[PDB]
C-alpha cells in the first residue's frame, strides 16, 4: 500500500494511495440559429393552420 505526491500546507494535505496498478461536432452559432428558426417556422405554420381553420 504505497502513499505518494504528499503535498502539505496550512489549510490541509493531499496525497494519492495506490494498492494494485492496472490489471492491464460541437456545432456553430449558425447551425444553432437554424435549429431555433426551423422550430419557430413549424410553430408559425401550425398557428397559420389554426387561423385558416378558424377563418373557415
Amino acid at each position: 500500500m504505497e502513499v505518494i505526491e504528499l503535498n502539505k500546507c496550512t489549510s490541509g494535505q493531499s496525497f494519492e494511495v495506490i494498492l494494485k496498478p492496472p490489471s492491464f461536432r460541437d456545432p456553430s452559432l449558425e447551425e444553432i440559429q437554424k435549429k431555433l428558426e426551423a422550430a419557430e417556422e413549424r410553430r408559425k405554420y401550425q398557428e397559420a393552420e389554426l387561423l385558416k381553420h378558424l377563418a373557415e
Partner: protein, 437 residues
C-alpha cells in the same frame, strides 16, 4: 488564480444557488453586505476564494454568479432576501412566463427570446476575469427551464468559450417531491442535448436526499430548504478545492483528468458522511474509519444504486476537519478486506485524498450538527447507470403511447428529437454495460 463562473438555471438551480452562496459566505467569513474583514488586500487580489468572488473598491465581495429563471417569483426572493446586497442586480435575470414543465418551450420557444441577454450578462463577468477556467451549471433535469434553457445555454457556452471547462450540478427527478409528470421526457431531452457540452456532471437524486433527511435528520416531510442545505454541504465539499489552498482538484480541468477518463461516462457518484441531526442532544463523534466506511453505504449516496455490482474508474476522498493521512490509510486498508471494490482492468485501484483541516461549517439554526470530521467520496462507478435505466424505462412507458408529445411538437419540436434523445441514452446505458461487466 483562475476564475470560475457559477450559473443557476430554473427554480432548482436558483434555490440550490442560494443555499451554496450562503454557505460559501459563512465558510470564507464574508458577511451578507459582502464585506470580508479577514481580507486585508482591499479592492482585489488573487487569493483562492477570488475564484468564486470578485472585489470592489468599497471592499465588497461579489459572487461570480448568474441566476436565470424564465419566471420572476424565485429570483425575486433572492432580490429582496437576506443576501440582496451581495449580488449585482444585472446577475439576476428573469422572464415573465415560465416553460410550463416543457423542455421544448424552455429550449425553442421562450429560450430564443432570452438566450442572447443571458450570454451578454455572462460575458460581462468573463471580462472581469484575468483567466476564466469555465463554468459550474446548477439546474433540475425535471423543469422546462432547468432542462430546456440549460441545454440551449450549454450549446452556446461551447461556441462563445470553447477552451473553457463546464461542470453540472443536476437534480434528478424524484416523484415524492416532483411537480410535473413529464420529468422523464425533460430529463432525456436535456441529457442528450447537453452530453457533449459537459466535462463532468454531479447528479443528485431528490429521492436519495429526501430519504437522508427523513432517516438521519428525523424530518417527517423534508422541504426544499431541508434538501437544499444538505445538497449545498455536498457541493461545498466538491468545490472547496477551488476556493482553498490545496494540491487536489485545483482547477476544473483536474475534475475531468481525476474523475472522467471516458468523456461520455462523466457522472461521478457523490457519497457523504456524516449527516447528524442538530436536535440530537447526545451524539458520540464518528472516527476517520467510521465515516470512510459510510462512503460505501448506498444509504449515504446522492443516488441510490449498488457500487458492488459495477466497476470503478476513479475514487477521490475529500475530508473536512480533524483528519490526518495515517487514519485515512488505516481506514482504507480495513475497508478493502470487508467490501467489494472492483476497478476496471485498465485503471489503478487507488484513491486520491484531499484534506482541508477546517471542519464543515453548518448554517446557524439549520438541521445539520457541527462534526469534527466529514468526508465526501467522488467515485466514477458504472453502478450509476441504474439511475439512467430507471429514467429510460419511465420514458419508454410514456413515449410508447406518445402521451404528452403533442405539448412538445406544439412548441416547434419534431417527434424525431424524442427517439434521437432516447437512442443516445440507449448508447450511454451500453457504454456503462461494456466498461462494467
Amino acid at each position: 488564480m483562475r476564475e470560475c463562473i457559477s450559473i443557476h438555471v430554473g427554480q432548482a438551480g436558483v434555490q440550490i444557488g442560494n443555499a451554496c452562496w450562503e454557505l460559501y459566505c459563512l465558510e470564507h467569513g464574508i458577511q451578507p453586505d459582502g464585506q470580508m474583514p479577514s481580507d486585508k488586500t482591499i479592492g482585489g487580489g488573487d487569493d483562492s476564494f477570488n475564484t468564486f468572488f470578485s472585489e470592489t473598491g468599497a471592499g465588497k465581495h461579489v459572487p461570480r454568479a448568474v441566476f436565470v429563471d424564465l419566471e420572476p417569483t424565485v429570483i425575486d426572493e433572492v432580490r429582496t432576501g437576506t443576501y440582496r446586497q451581495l449580488f449585482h442586480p444585472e446577475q439576476l435575470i428573469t422572464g415573465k412566463e415560465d416553460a410550463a414543465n416543457n423542455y421544448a418551450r424552455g429550449h425553442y420557444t421562450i429560450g430564443k427570446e432570452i438566450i442572447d441577454l443571458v450570454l451578454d450578462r455572462i460575458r460581462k463577468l468573463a471580462d472581469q476575469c484575468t483567466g476564466l477556467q469555465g463554468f459550474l451549471v446548477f439546474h433540475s433535469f425535471g423543469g422546462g427551464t432547468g432542462s430546456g434553457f440549460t441545454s440551449l445555454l450549454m450549446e452556446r457556452l461551447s461556441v462563445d468559450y470553447g477552451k473553457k471547462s463546464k461542470l453540472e450540478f443536476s437534480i434528478y427527478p424524484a416523484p415524492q417531491v416532483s411537480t410535473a409528470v413529464v420529468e422523464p421526457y425533460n430529463s432525456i431531452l436535456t441529457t442528450h442535448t447537453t452530453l457533449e457540452h459537459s466535462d463532468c456532471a454531479f447528479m443528485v437524486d431528490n429521492e436519495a436526499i429526501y430519504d437522508i433527511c427523513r432517516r438521519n435528520l428525523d424530518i417527517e416531510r423534508p422541504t426544499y430548504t431541508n434538501l437544499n442545505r444538505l445538497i449545498s454541504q455536498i457541493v461545498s465539499s466538491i468545490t472547496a478545492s477551488l476556493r482553498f489552498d490545496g494540491a487536489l482538484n485545483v482547477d476544473l480541468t483536474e475534475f475531468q483528468t481525476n474523475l472522467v477518463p471516458y468523456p461520455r461516462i462523466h457522472f461521478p457518484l457523490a457519497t457523504y458522511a456524516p449527516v447528524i441531526s442538530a436536535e440530537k442532544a447526545y451524539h458520540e463523534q464518528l472516527s476517520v474509519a467510521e465515516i470512510t466506511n459510510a462512503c460505501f453505504e448506498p444509504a449515504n449516496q446522492m443516488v441510490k444504486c449498488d457500487p458492488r455490482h459495477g466497476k470503478y474508474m476513479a475514487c477521490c476522498l475529500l475530508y473536512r476537519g480533524d483528519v490526518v493521512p495515517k487514519d485515512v490509510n488505516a481506514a482504507i486498508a480495513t475497508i478493502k478486506t470487508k467490501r467489494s471494490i472492483q476497478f476496471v482492468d485498465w485503471c489503478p485501484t487507488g484513491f486520491k485524498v484531499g484534506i482541508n483541516y477546517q471542519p464543515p461549517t453548518v448554517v446557524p439554526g439549520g438541521d445539520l450538527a457541527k462534526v469534527q470530521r466529514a468526508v465526501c467520496m467522488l467515485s466514477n462507478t458504472t453502478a450509476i447507470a441504474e439511475a439512467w435505466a430507471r429514467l429510460d424505462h419511465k420514458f419508454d412507458l410514456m413515449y410508447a403511447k406518445r402521451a404528452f408529445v403533442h405539448w412538445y411538437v406544439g412548441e416547434g419540436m419534431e417527434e424525431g428529437e424524442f427517439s434521437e434523445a432516447r437512442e443516445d441514452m440507449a448508447a450511454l446505458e451500453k457504454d456503462y454495460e461494456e466498461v462494467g461487466v
